Design a protein around this ligand. Structure first.
Ligand SMILES: CCc1sc(C(=O)N[C@@H]2[C@H](N)CCCC2(F)F)cc1-c1cnn2cc(C(F)(F)F)cnc12
Length: 304
């Protein structure tokens, strides 16, 4: 019930290799989520994917992507201390509260587009965008989680169902069209019992659209759910769309740029010394994006 500066609370996730636990940072009192991985139970390729995952995580800084704080290493187990998305899956939110009204789907979807574009810019392709990997904080903001399979069938592009060419950003774009479709309707655009039916409908690319849907919504989905990855619209282009910006007259959705982070908050620096941190230790490990006990404590003292 303790690893590093963390008290392990309850398991909040379980995969076929990893488990996520809610934890409390004993110094700052902040809640975090730790993705626990037993490296001994992993085959050589998933071990390679876990190392890719940790690298990708290190190179991302967006307010709508679950952020890494600390990496606790042991011979047999890897500990990935990240943000805790308090309100859970969007999937659950939809079953619990019904389809989202377009103002709500727009608020959430703009964030997803900002976050997914940022990844493509920093040469990352999520490859697992599902409503499961989409979560919320207490202020109901999207936080894209996982990155295990980066560089599900109902969200998978037609080319991947065939076993065709790679490319990348385009496969995440088809998924975003599947996400928006669920956000506004509650259901998935393409389904069907056994895998053969789902494969057929994704490939035919035919989806019903509900009477309540706005004409601008039905249009914006056609830009994403393009059966041809080449003719599929780009995120820089879709960000300019009528729908994405309804009720955002001044602020049209433009690509995210990571701002200048202040690694010199005099108030958080002194408050750390009163715990056991030294001037030389803080300065040396803050200036450098190390992700250690020090870095984590400083980022957590401005979170609450
Ligand atoms: C450490 C931060 C991570 S890594 C990550 C993750 O990789 N999950 C995968 C997989 N998609 C599901 C099975 C376990 C798995 F294999 F690990 C998810 C989270 C996370 C952050 N806040 N939070 C809140 C909840 C919830 F809903 F509130 F319970 C659930 N998960 C989280």
């Amino acid at each position: 019930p303790h690893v590093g500066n963390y008290r392990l609370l309850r398991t909040i996730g379980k995969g076929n290799f990893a488990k996520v636990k809610l934890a409390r940072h004993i110094l700052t009192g902040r809640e975090v989520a730790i993705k626990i991985i037993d490296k001994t139970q992993l085959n050589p390729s998933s071990l390679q994917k876990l190392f890719r995952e940790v690298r990708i995580m290190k190179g991302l800084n967006h307010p709508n992507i679950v952020k890494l704080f600390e990496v606790i290493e042991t011979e047999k187990t890897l500990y990935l201390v990240m943000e805790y998305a308090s309100a859970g899956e969007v999937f659950d939110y939809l079953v619990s509260h019904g389809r989202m009204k377009e103002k709500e789907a727009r608020a959430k979807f703009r964030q997803i587009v900002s976050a997914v574009h940022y990844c493509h810019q920093k040469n990352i392709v999520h490859r697992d965008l599902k409503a499961e990997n989409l979560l919320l904080d207490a202020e109901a903001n999207i936080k894209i989680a996982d990155f295990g399979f980066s560089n599900s069938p109902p969200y998978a592009a037609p080319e991947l169902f065939q076993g065709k060419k790679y490319d990348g950003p385009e496969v995440d774009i088809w998924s975003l069209g599947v996400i928006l479709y669920t956000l506004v309707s509650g259901s998935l655009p393409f389904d069907g019992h056994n895998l053969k039916e789902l494969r057929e409908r994704v490939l035919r690319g035919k989806y019903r659209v509900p009477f309540y849907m706005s004409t601008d919504c039905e249009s914006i989905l056609r830009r994403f759910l393009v059966l041809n990855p080449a003719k599929r619209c780009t995120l820089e282009q879709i960000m300019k769309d009528k729908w994405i910006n309804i009720g955002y007259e001044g602020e049209e959705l433009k690509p995210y740029t990571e701002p200048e982070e202040d690694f010199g908050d005099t108030k958080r620096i002194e408050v750390m010394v009163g715990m056991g941190y030294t001037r030389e230790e803080i300065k040396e490990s803050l200036t450098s994006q190390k992700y250690n006990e020090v870095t984590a404590t400083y980022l957590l003292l401005g979170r609450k």
